[PDB]
């Protein structure tokens, strides 16, 4: 009964803190969208834009805004088909490489925090030269270095 047309495994979603928008039919997807606000102060938007348009129209990420606040994201060249534009705050992009194989592009980004609350949700608009996406996204802290951070009495 569990191998049916509705199964538990086939329903499951990515155990990640960000949201996603786009289907099998949509030309441009966004994956793992989340407003990353550090516990020190820095903030930004984490996301991955993915072009999969079969008409081979490139999409340039023109602008990103979070609860109406503009995002600074360093210069990105357009996303051709089966290319990916990765984005995070620079402190977290320094922890991974930028592949020479395939088509991946890392761009740092940052927000001026108006005072978002941890745990909450805010609407995020991606605007491409072809169109637009709107998606709710949770405000969250970035991940830690695994296995180094003990907690203390304070």
């Amino acid at each position: 009964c569990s191998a049916g047309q509705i199964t538990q495994t086939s329903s499951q979603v990515a155990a990640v803190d960000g949201n996603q928008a786009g289907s099998a039919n949509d030309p441009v997807l966004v994956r793992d969208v989340t407003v990353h606000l550090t516990t020190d102060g820095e903030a930004g938007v984490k996301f991955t834009a993915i072009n999969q348009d079969t008409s081979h129209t490139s999409h340039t990420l023109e602008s990103v805004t979070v609860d109406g606040e503009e995002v600074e994201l360093d210069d990105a060249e357009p996303i051709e088909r089966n290319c990916s534009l990765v984005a995070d705050i620079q402190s977290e992009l320094d922890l991974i490489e930028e592949p020479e194989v395939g088509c991946i592009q890392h761009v740092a980004t940052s927000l001026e925090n108006p005072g978002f609350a941890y745990g909450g949700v805010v609407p995020v608009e991606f605007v491409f030269d072809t169109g637009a996406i709107t998606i709710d996204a949770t405000v969250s802290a970035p991940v830690l270095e695994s296995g180094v951070e003990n907690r203390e009495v304070g």
Binding site: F116, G120, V122
Partner: peptide, 24 residues
């Protein structure tokens, strides 16, 4: 045979928004 105080909320969740005050 159902609890008489266990209804669905008539009003839908409005997708509200939070914030915190700050020094700057």
């Amino acid at each position: 045979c159902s609890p008489p105080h266990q209804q669905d909320s008539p009003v839908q969740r409005t997708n509200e928004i939070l914030t915190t005050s700050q020094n700057p």
